DNA sequence: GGAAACAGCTATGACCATGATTACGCTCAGGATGTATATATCTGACACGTGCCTGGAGACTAGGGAGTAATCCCCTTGGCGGTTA
């Protein structure tokens, strides 16, 4: 059985277009751009990563996060579809900090999962893998990094794997 | 009927409360003192004219400092992963 591949070209969120211009035109201000590569990469990845895109002193946790994000709207659609389809999904990303927001947004949707990140533990890696690969595991999603997570482990219990970033 | 025993009354001392007195401080008094003020008058120093002259300001040439292009490559940068003190 082969594998399918689709590249979900989604438009960059209009809400963060303010800050994306604020990065291109150097408009928010008075910070580093020593690696314009990464700065645009983080804005390409997620807006709240720039330390002030989340204005709330209580830091509200609601649909605004998926609202202000370009990708998570398609993610929310695909998570709803794959939940009914029973697809056991794996998510890969580069920024461990971004995964915190996904961990927070996983809490919002109340999914079971296990978060493996660079330098979590030794026994925690084993146990989180076991719970995810446990038979009939309801851990519908699985947070994982890119350069720390997928270098030899087998996840045949899963079928669909999604990249947040390239 | 007498003696003991207890109870109540009385007085006195003790202790606390109030009144006065005093002393000390201070804040007014008042004196002492030293300071500001004004004024009228010297006077020396600062400002200004005069003369002069030599640096300043052009005027002119020439030759390499500075300026730019192109090139490159090494290095700083940043995020992570995983340790541990």
Curated annotation (Swiss-Prot):
Residues 74-166 form the Helicase C-terminal domain. Belongs to the SNF2/RAD54 helicase family. ISWI subfamily. The lineage of its organism: Eukaryota, Fungi, Dikarya, Ascomycota, Saccharomycotina. It comes from Saccharomyces cerevisiae (strain ATCC 204508 / S288c) (Baker's yeast). The chain holds residues 422 to 598 of 1129 of the full protein. It is found in: Nucleus. Catalytic component of ISW1-type complexes, which act by remodeling the chromatin by catalyzing an ATP-dependent alteration in the structure of nucleosomal DNA. They are involved in coordinating transcriptional repression, activation and elongation phases. The ISW1A complex represses gene expression at initiation through specific positioning of a promoter proximal dinucleosome. The ISW1B complex acts within coding regions to control the amount of RNA polymerase II released into productive elongation and to coordinate elongation with termination and pre-mRNA processing. Disulfide bonds: none annotated. Present with 1500 molecules/cell in log phase SD medium. Component of the ISW1A complex, which at least consists of ISW1 and IOC3. Component of the ISW1B complex, which at least consists of ISW1, IOC2 and IOC4. This is ISWI chromatin-remodeling complex ATPase ISW1.
